[PDB]
Design a protein around this ligand. Structure first.
Ligand code: 5QN
Length: 114
């Protein structure tokens, strides 16, 4: 099956917007982690493949995904980076867990429809 870029955008962008809409939980994920600004210079020593909502959105807008599972992989890369880097008591870690719950719920019916 070939998935056209606009088909993927129409189906998958609403699932990304569902993550963006989460407040407070999406706020640390709306832009790439800037380790200098945030005062966490060890970040890139631990997270080798950074990912965030704005990068995923740009990839959808520029047709960088051929298959739905590639989009899902990037969302999960974002989650796994945050669970890897952050302590389990931290805001970012617990916010990540909430976003993963939202995403699981949103992506399932969409995948059925694709
Ligand atoms: C200090 C440690 O922070 C982090 C550590 C790890 C990670 C990840 C993904 O692993 C992320 C962060 N945090 C951030 O990236 C971050 C970035 C910007 C934020 O807000 C943006 C601005 N707005 C809020 C203030 N006024 C208006 C506009 C936030 C935030 O607000 O989270 C609650 C977090």
């Amino acid at each position: 099956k070939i998935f056209k870029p606009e088909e993927l955008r129409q189906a998958l962008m609403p699932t990304l917007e569902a993550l963006y809409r989460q407040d407070p939980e999406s706020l640390p994920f709306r832009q790439p982690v800037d380790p200098q600004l945030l005062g966490i210079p060890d970040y890139f020593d631990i997270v080798k493949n950074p990912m965030d909502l704005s990068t995923i959105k740009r990839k959808l807008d520029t047709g960088q995904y051929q298959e739905p599972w590639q989009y899902v992989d990037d969302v999960w890369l974002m989650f796994n980076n945050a669970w890897l880097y952050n302590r389990k008591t931290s805001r970012v870690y617990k916010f990540c867990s909430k976003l993963a719950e939202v995403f699981e719920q949103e992506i399932d019916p969409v995948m059925q429809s694709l």
